[PDB]
Ligand binder design. Structure first.
Ligand SMILES: O[C@@H]1[C@@H](O)[C@H](O[C@@H]2CO[C@@H](O[C@@H]3CO[C@@H](O[C@@H]4CO[C@@H](O)[C@H](O)[C@H]4O)[C@H](O)[C@H]3O)[C@H](O)[C@H]2O)OC[C@H]1O
Ligand SMILES: *[C@@H]1O[C@H](CO)[C@@H](O[C@@H]2O[C@H](CO)[C@@H](O)[C@H](O)[C@H]2NC(C)=O)[C@H](O)[C@H]1NC(C)=O
Ligand SMILES: *[C@H]1O[C@H](CO)[C@@H](O)[C@H](O)[C@@H]1O
Length: 221
């Protein structure tokens, strides 16, 4: 169990809950056909009306912690219990307004992931743990400026030998990409991008040799 609940943009911490729709619970989403797979559900109200300005090319940190409160001191399961092996992923979708309530029917492109590295037997989740819940990635330099949602996700595959089983821990940040260029990548639907036959979603982690995280290939300029 883990929750993405704060952002840092080019080394500046925005504050707990700022520009993120923070779920009230650290309970996972498990239904990949639910609209809950888009940006989670049950947000702490009132939801932030901050939209973080981020230059295209800028470095973002999405902060995960064990609970929706963020950092509350030492905890052996903060940011997650590292027995929960799996990937970490980040997607963007262009939106008319990053504070709009309706997140359905958006087109999501993947900008970062960290899956499994066979030679070191290390998962993205292990690195997230080592990094104190910091999922650090760059916003592609060539993107069209404007408002976007930033969907960042930690998947636990501990119970993923069947479907349902995989546990999806995700939130959406609210950003305004500045500068940039004119690229508007092709995206995928949520729900829809993840299916019950995807071997990134149904897998035995005690039988992993190679692993491919679910969803489309990472977009890069
Ligand atoms: O079908 C029903 C489900 O939808 C429901 O789940 C709840 C759906 O409403 C959620 O609250 C939302 C949170 O998002 C707000 O949107 C904006 C977020 O950005 C802000 O900057 C802006 O001001 C907000 O407008 C939206 O206003 C608010 O309603 C709630 O958290 C979910 O639990 O459950 C019942 C199902 O039957
Ligand atoms: C995770 O991210 C935070 C940024 O939110 C890092 O904290 C900052 O570290 C820099 C340089 O190391 C300092 O200038 C800031 O004063 C720190 N801010 C804090 C502690 O709130 C933090 O080091 C990262 N954690 C890990 C384990 O990498
Ligand atoms: C944002 O910051 C990181 C270093 O903190 C860089 O690695 C990245 O290229 C971007 O400048």
């Amino acid at each position: 169990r883990t929750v993405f609940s704060s952002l840092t943009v080019n080394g500046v911490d925005l504050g707990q809950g700022v520009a993120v729709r923070v779920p009230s619970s650290n309970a996972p989403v498990t239904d990949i056909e639910s609209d809950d797979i888009i940006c989670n559900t049950g947000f702490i109200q009132p939801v932030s009306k901050t939209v973080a300005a981020v230059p295209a090319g800028g470095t973002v940190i999405a902060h995960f912690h064990h609970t929706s409160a963020g950092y509350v001191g030492p905890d052996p399961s903060d940011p997650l219990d590292p027995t929960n092996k799996g990937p970490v992923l980040a997607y963007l979708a262009k939106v008319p307004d990053a504070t709009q309530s309706d997140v359905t029917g958006l087109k999501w492109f993947k900008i970062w992931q960290d899956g499994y590295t066979p030679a070191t037997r290390q998962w993205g989740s292990d690195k997230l743990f080592i990094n104190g819940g910091n999922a650090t990635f760059t916003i592609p330099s060539c993107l069209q400026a404007g408002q976007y949602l930033l969907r960042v996700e930690s998947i636990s595959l501990l119970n993923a030998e069947q479907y349902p089983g995989a546990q999806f821990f995700l939130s959406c940040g609210q950003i305004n990409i500045t500068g940039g260029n004119k690229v508007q990548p092709v995206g995928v639907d949520f729900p829809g991008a993840y299916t019950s036959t995807d071997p990134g979603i149904v897998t035995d982690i005690y039988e992993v040799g190679t692993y491919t995280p679910p969803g489309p290939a990472v977009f890069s300029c």
